Symmetry: C3
């Protein structure tokens, strides 16, 4: 449309749609109960992202936020996506290593705090306070990355695949707070169309790329 | 009130209230842990519906949506109801057949997508796009109905009762997308007062009728 | 600020922050899987409350509701807090006594109804109807208190600690509907600044005080 960022929302829509169908077809035939879990979780993630990319594309998931005395376009639908997809991504890792339920609840809950405070920050009209919410959200993210690194007799296959996905996760997830900070939600150093591109690349890698690694491994089978 | 559809919201309120109290009293005394689950799930469903029918009745769960250059009355509270009650209904079926957790997560997640895209469609102001959301939601529903039919050594009692509830579910749930399509949320072929009547009949059958079948069966006991 | 109630939102923010860090440090080293669950649940509760107290403090979690022909300040963020923290509090009790899953689902669901109808009541613009929502919410609360009292061979340690926390819970939770009723959300008999103080004291006792009792007991260890 007249929104320069439309092309990246269109491409992301397409790529999440296509990954969803690919993982769907792939999980056809799986009867192993353990594998079943990894396919459900991993197929759902880009399915949800597909819907929220399309809602941004059609303009539904966009709102105007007054701050710095301007009307700032804020894509709120990203937070509806992440609210569900990031705990699912953490569940994939947690199941792989057979984490204790107490640790899974710590992780999902920290995650909810991360996304919910990011959303409040995105919609806050007092500019300086936006970054207070950014910092609390970032602290939640560092708690999560900590646990993925220092909170975990797995069969070798499990440990191998987990080490790769854990390294993927730390690198990609750590980039999101930076893009927000420099982008239209934060300091406004990078235009919205470039921000939208950055988040598209991170999202497709974190969802489809990550699932391609996981669903190709024997680590998911009993 | 001055809303011709009030009578059906009043009747639905009453019928969901009464079913909730009936199942409540009925589950008094049950000590079988397995039966306990079916009573909790099955009592909660019309309890939630009761509150959302009352919110429509009192006018709280109604908003105006501009589309086709008019102010269209949209009852959004239905989606708050269904967001919780339809996965619970699916949990009743899934527990009956002892489904794998991976399959339960596929089902609840597809369901969330179904209701959430229906809600976006209901609130979208660009008329043609309303039906794009309708179609994606419908695809999620067909995924769910598929799984209930081709994704499932149960004791005979389980298989019997499941076959009846599965047939009830496919027939009733399949009607909802049609009522939406022909009603005030969609093409506007049927007036709001008749739409509201249709949804009342489906809801009371899908919640109270369905629970009456289930809670009468020995299939729910270990 | 210019809001007389700010001081109590500031103190609550601080006290929830401090309890969160205290329980965090305390749970460092715990390896017992059962203890792990109680620490996760119990640390998360004031973590969430911290964020919602801060959102009230900064003004984000406040909205104006027209009723009785005035503009009534309503802190909606309390309901976002309670929606997650009160089922977690109930999960702490339920795990302690090893409740059946059917009973846990009854409890969490009744709780969701309690908070969600309280939220509708808080935002309803027709004054008399506010108290209809109050009454339904109160009925949900009485269902919950009933179950905590008449729905439950635990080792003595479990029974002891549970009896104390159950008595704490009944007394504190029962006060919330009274404060709402007499406060700015209800009859407007008590000013907002005094209401905010009352809820701060209840919240810090129900979250941090309650967790201090629980996390000090051996009841949480296998
Ligand atoms: C758990 C465990 C962890 C708990 C996390 C702690 C932090 C909780 C934060 C939450 C608070 C939510 C804030 C919010 C709901 C405020 C919305 O009002 C905005 C502010 O004026 C108005 O913007 C205009 C509109 C904006 C759009 C916001 C919509 C978003 C909705 C995304 C949610 C999804 C749910 C799917 C529903 C189907
Ligand atoms: C560790 C702590 C306890 C965590 C708490 C963090 C809270 C930080 C509060 C943010 C605040 C101090 C920054 C306020 C912006 C300030 C430089 C500019 C002052 O006024 C400006 C123009 O009058 C604001 O307009 C707008 C001009 C802009 C384009 C200014 C952009 C602001 C940027 C803020 C960047 C914060 C990241 C530095 C933090 C990295 C660590
Ligand atoms: C997409 C970004 C914008 C671009 C940044 C690309 C950097 C590439 C990351 C390399 C990392 C991958 C690790 C390779 C593997 C080796 C790790 O295995 C170790 C041995 O068991 C695990 O120990 C412990 C494992 C340690 C691994 C931690 C990885 C580091 C985390 C990187 C933080 C993020 C970067 C922030 C982006 C920037 C734009 C702000
Ligand atoms: C999971 C697994 C699956 C994830 C599903 C993928 C699709 C996600 C869609 C979600 C997005 C939610 C959209 C939304 C929150 C937008 C609201 O703004 C409206 C659009 O202008 C304004 O209408 C005016 C107001 C309208 C009213 C909307 C309110 C509704 C609230 C129902 C939710 C219930 C929660 C109970 C809270 C107590
Ligand atoms: C399988 C596909 C890939 C799935 C994707 C589906 C997307 C469908 C997009 C809907 C769109 C093509 C229909 C747009 C309405 C069109 C006939 C009328 C054109 O303009 C009208 C008046 O200028 C719109 O006003 C309003 C006049 C109205 C009363 C028109 C009502 C529209 C009706 C749409 C019905 C769609 C169901 C046919 C689909 C059943 C299959
Ligand atoms: C069938 C599958 C996807 C269908 C592909 C379509 C191709 C879109 O072509 C252009 C129509 O001029 C889209 O621009 C139209 C302007 C606007 C763009 C909105 C279209 C988007 C649709 C993306 C997929 C849709 C999904 C429909 C439901 C599906 C799951 C059955
Ligand atoms: C309420 C609606 C508006 C009115 C429509 C009423 C139609 C009555 C449905 C009959 C069906 C019940 C099946 C009877 C039983 C027999 C099935 O057992 C089979 C043997 O194990 C199961 O195999 C496989 C089982 C096969 C069963 C699939 C049932 C069909 C599903 C019907 C789709 C829906 C209709 C849409 C409504 C219309 C208004 C658009
Ligand atoms: C389950 C099991 C049990 C189901 C409970 C049954 C009762 C369901 C009730 C729910 C309905 C929600 C109502 C709502 C979403 C209506 C919002 O519109 C308001 C009314 O005009 C506008 O006020 C202006 C704005 C107001 C602010 C409301 C925001 C609140 C958000 C709190 C939710 C949190 C979620 C975290 C998201 C991150
Ligand atoms: C067990 C039942 C089935 C449960 C259902 C409960 C529904 C109760 C409906 C509330 C309604 C009858 C009270 C309406 C307020 C009424 C006294 C005042 C009439 O008009 C007033 C001024 O014209 C309203 O303005 C505002 C003046 C105010 C400051 C009046 C405050 C109202 C107070 C209501 C208190 C209700 C608690 C009594 C109930 C305790 C039991
Ligand atoms: C006691 C139980 C239900 C009480 C029945 C009441 C009967 C309503 O009579 C009319 C009052 O003139 C309702 O129209 C009044 C006009 C408006 C209608 C709103 C009333 C509705 C109330 C439906 C049930 C209420 C629930 C109260 C909480 C209950 C769970 C304790
Ligand atoms: C904070 C409020 C505003 C102030 C009210 C302070 C009252 C202090 C409550 C005392 C209670 C604590 C019980 C002590 C212990 C003994 C109980 O053990 C019993 C033997 O197994 C359990 O049987 C059965 C256990 C029975 C215990 C039920 C306790 C009662 C519940 C109190 C209802 C609430 C009060 C409402 C507050 C008022 C302001 C409206
Ligand atoms: C059959 C397999 C290989 C998957 C193909 C399904 C299609 C959709 C996504 C698959 C590709 C993505 C690889 C994961 C990692 C990346 C860093 C993706 C970032 C996007 C950049 C655009 C490059 C081209 C693409 C169209 C994939
Ligand atoms: C004790 C038993 C039989 C239950 C009675 C509790 C009351 C509430 C609901 C029970 C009746 C509903 C039967 C399920 C199926 C239906 C198709 C219901 C659709 C509604 C149509 C109105 C007909 C009359 C009613 C008042 C039940
Ligand atoms: C190390 C221990 C004792 C905990 C201290 C951590 C700090 C935060 C909360 C701890 C104190 C609260 C006790 C629980 C019960 C109460 C009734 C609290 C209500 C608040 C009243 C204010 C009194 C002083 C306070 C600053 C704690
Ligand atoms: C599918 C997408 C994923 C994996 C997205 C992850 C998003 C985050 C890790 C976002 C984190 C943020 C913060 C740490 C700071 C505040 C802003 C956020 C929400 C972008
Ligand atoms: C208690 C009520 C139940 C069982 C309701 C079920 C509702 C659905 C199956 C609704 C489905 C819809 C679609 C498939 C298309 C878009 C519109 C919806 C949300 C009505
Ligand atoms: C951390 C805070 C807790 C334990 C809060 C509990 C809040 C309740 C028990 C609130 C109950 C209410 C009703 C019973 C009636 C309507 C108003 C409410 C929501 C305050």
């Amino acid at each position: 449309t007249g929104r320069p960022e439309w092309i990246w929302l269109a491409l992301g829509t397409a790529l999440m749609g296509l990954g969803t169908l690919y993982f769907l077809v792939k999980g056809m035939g799986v009867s192993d109960p353990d594998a079943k879990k990894f396919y459900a979780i991993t197929t759902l993630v880009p399915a949800i992202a597909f819907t929220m990319y399309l809602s941004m594309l059609l303009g539904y998931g966009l709102t105007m936020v007054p701050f710095g005395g301007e009307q700032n376009p804020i894509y709120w639908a990203r937070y509806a996506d992440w609210l569900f997809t990031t705990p699912l991504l953490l569940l994939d890792l947690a199941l792989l290593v057979d984490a204790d339920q107490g640790t899974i609840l710590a992780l999902v809950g920290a995650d909810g705090i991360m996304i919910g405070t990011g959303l409040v920050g995105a919609l806050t009209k007092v500019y300086s306070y936006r970054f207070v919410w950014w910092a609390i959200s970032t602290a939640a993210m560092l708690y999560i990355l900590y646990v993925l690194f220092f909170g975990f007799s797995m069969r070798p296959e499990v440990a191998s695949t987990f080490k790769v996905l854990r390294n993927v996760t730390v690198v990609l997830w750590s980039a999101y707070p930076v893009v927000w900070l420099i982008g239209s939600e934060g300091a406004g150093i990078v235009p919205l169309n470039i921000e939208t591109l950055l988040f598209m690349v991170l999202d497709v890698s974190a969802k489809v790329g990550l699932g391609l690694i996981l669903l190709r491994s024997r680590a998911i089978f009993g």
